[PDB]
Every structure is written in structure tokens, then in C-alpha cells.
Symmetry: C2
């Protein structure tokens, strides 16, 4: 996808942010957005095309792929990026609003509360997506999925495309997410002390 606009806004955000925040935005751009576009989207491109079920039943592969993958991992990661970035956009907008207010007439007062809330929201959204992915997929895609959804007769064996590569990238993104959490914790403590 085209992340250009979000890029513009977040680049603006870098200036009005802590050094650790600039590190966080670098991580977001490089290890999350760029990995997803350059590497992961191609991994998941044949997810349903090369999903195969051992059966002659029409409609079984469709319902089985749908039950195994209610949302694709890459779409989940898109949404995670958007939601962890939204607080930064809120804070940046409040900052620009105060600048416009000054013109009509760095981090302190209302902006400090807003920045702390921004880090907080980023952390909660962060953790939330991590836990949701754990409960939806664990952290390993196995090659076999056994499916008993109508119209499949009895239980059918279905086979995943590229499960090991997908597992590698699942874990890569989990690690990047954990690094982001650590960075946000560092921001909180660094402001505190």
C-alpha cells in the first residue's frame, strides 16, 4: 500500500518528539512498514490460492480457509500500525494547534499530559494487538489444518502455504512489537527521571 500521507504526518511528529520517540518512529518506518511492503506481502500473496484441501466437495476449501484465517496476519499488522500511530497524530495535532494559537496571539503543561497519554495509548494498543494475535493464532502456523465446517464432509485435511516463512515473519514482527514496548517504557521513565 501507499503509506505516503501517514509518512508525512509522522515525519512532522519526529521534530516535536523525544529522541527515544524518533527512534520509535524509525523502527515503525523501517522494521514494520518497510518489512511488510518489501517482504511479508509477497509471503502472504498466495495464501488462499495455494491453500489446498483433500476433498472433492465444492465450497470446502473456501470455508476452511476462512475458518483457519478469519483475518490475514498482514491485514492485522496494517491495522496495528494505524492504531499505534494514531496517538502520535493526536499529540502532533495538539502541538500544531498550540503553535497556531501562539501565532494568533517545548514539552510542558498541557502538552506534557498529552504526550504521556500518547505514550500510554501507544502502549495499550501495542499490548492489545500482541495479545489478540496470541489468542487468534498463537505464534506458529502449522502446515496442517483440520476442518469440519459445513459443507466439508466429516473432517478434512487442508494444507497451508509457506507455514515456516510465515512463522519466521510472525516472530519477527512480535519481536519488533516487543522492542516498541521497551522503547515506550524508556520514554515514560526518561520523562519521569
Amino acid at each position: 500500500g501507499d503509506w505516503s500521507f501517514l509518512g508525512r504526518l509522522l515525519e512532522n511528529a519526529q521534530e516535536h518528539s523525544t529522541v527515544i520517540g524518533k527512534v520509535w518512529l524509525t523502527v515503525l518506518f523501517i522494521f514494520r512498514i518497510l518489512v511488510l511492503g518489501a517482504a511479508a506481502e509477497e509471503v502472504w500473496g498466495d495464501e488462499q490460492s495455494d491453500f489446498t484441501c483433500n476433498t472433492q466437495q465444492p465450497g470446502c476449501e473456501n470455508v476452511c480457509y476462512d475458518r483457519a484465517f478469519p483475518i490475514s496476519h498482514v491485514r492485522f499488522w496494517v491495522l496495528q500500525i494505524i492504531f499505534v500511530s494514531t496517538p502520535t497524530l493526536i499529540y502532533l495535532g495538539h502541538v500544531l494547534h498550540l503553535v497556531r494559537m501562539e501565532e494568533k496571539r517545548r514539552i510542558a503543561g498541557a502538552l506534557l499530559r498529552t504526550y504521556v497519554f500518547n505514550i500510554i495509548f501507544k502502549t495499550l494498543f501495542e499490548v492489545g494487538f500482541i495479545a489478540g494475535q496470541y489468542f487468534l493464532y498463537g505464534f506458529q502456523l502449522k502446515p496442517l489444518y483440520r476442518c469440519d465446517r459445513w459443507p466439508c464432509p466429516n473432517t478434512v485435511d487442508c494444507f497451508i502455504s509457506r507455514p515456516t516463512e510465515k512463522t519466521i515473519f510472525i516472530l519477527f514482527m512480535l519481536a519488533v512489537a516487543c522492542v516498541s514496548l521497551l522503547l515506550n517504557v524508556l520514554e515514560i521513565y526518561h520523562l519521569g527521571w
Copy 2:
């Protein structure tokens, strides 16, 4: 098949047999041999050809047809005919042997014991095939057979050719077999009294 030779021998047997025995041989020829050749063999001709299993697994239809039908009904009926007819052949041979003995030099003495044993053996073989078929197939072929024999993955649904016609003929032959039993009982009692 060509039952001509057995026919010759059994025709000979008719002369040296009771009236009820001639009825029994008429039943054998007409309602068992002729039905099998004229009607049933065509019913069972497509038994494996039109046996269908819902799967893509190579070898599953073969092992599933084999598990559902370890012996075909028509082959069972062939063997039943042969074995219920063998005692009559024994008795007829003993009779011809006594005739040859007389030439070298109706039912009484040794021939009477042999005739009673012939009826007995016919009755035991009769009942035995009936009970064996009950324990192997019951008396109704259902249209669905669920098969979990390797290499079939999990349980697969397989579908029988012509199950209702096959059931009709299964029951027809059961009835003919029971009529034969009744005739043999009548022979025993008629000799007794």
C-alpha cells in the same frame, strides 16, 4: 456362469429323490441359479466401477470398497448354491454305486441313512450361510459407507451403487433360502411319518 454340469448331476438326482426333493431342486434351479444369472449378476456388475468416495486421495476408493464388501453378495450366493448342492451329489453317487454293485452281482437301509444325512447337511449348510450373511451385511445395504481405512485421510464418505435394488434381491434370496429350509424340514418329517 455355466452351471450345465451341476445341472446334469442334479437332474439325475431328481429321479432318485422324494417329491419334496424334486420341488427343492426346482427351487434351486429356478429361484436361485436363474435369478442370479438373469437378474442379480447385472445388478452387481458395476459394484466397484460406480462406487464413489468423496476424496482426492489415491487408493482410498479401493480400500474402502474392499472394506465395505469383502466378498460380493453374488459370489456368496454362488458358494451357497455349490455347498447346499454337494450333499445331494454325495447321495446320488452312493445310489449310483449301489446300482453298479447290483449290476456286478428304493430308499431303504444304507441309502436311507445317507438320505437323512443329506437332508441334514443341506439344512446345516443352509442355516450357516444365512447366519454368516446376517453377521457380515445384515439384510439392508445403506447408500452411505463411512470409511477410515488407510490411506483415506480422517473418515471419508463413500457411496454405494444401486443399494435399494441390491436390498430387494438380498431379501428375495433370503426368502428363497428360508423356503428351502422349510422344504427340508418337510422332507425330514415326511420320511419320519
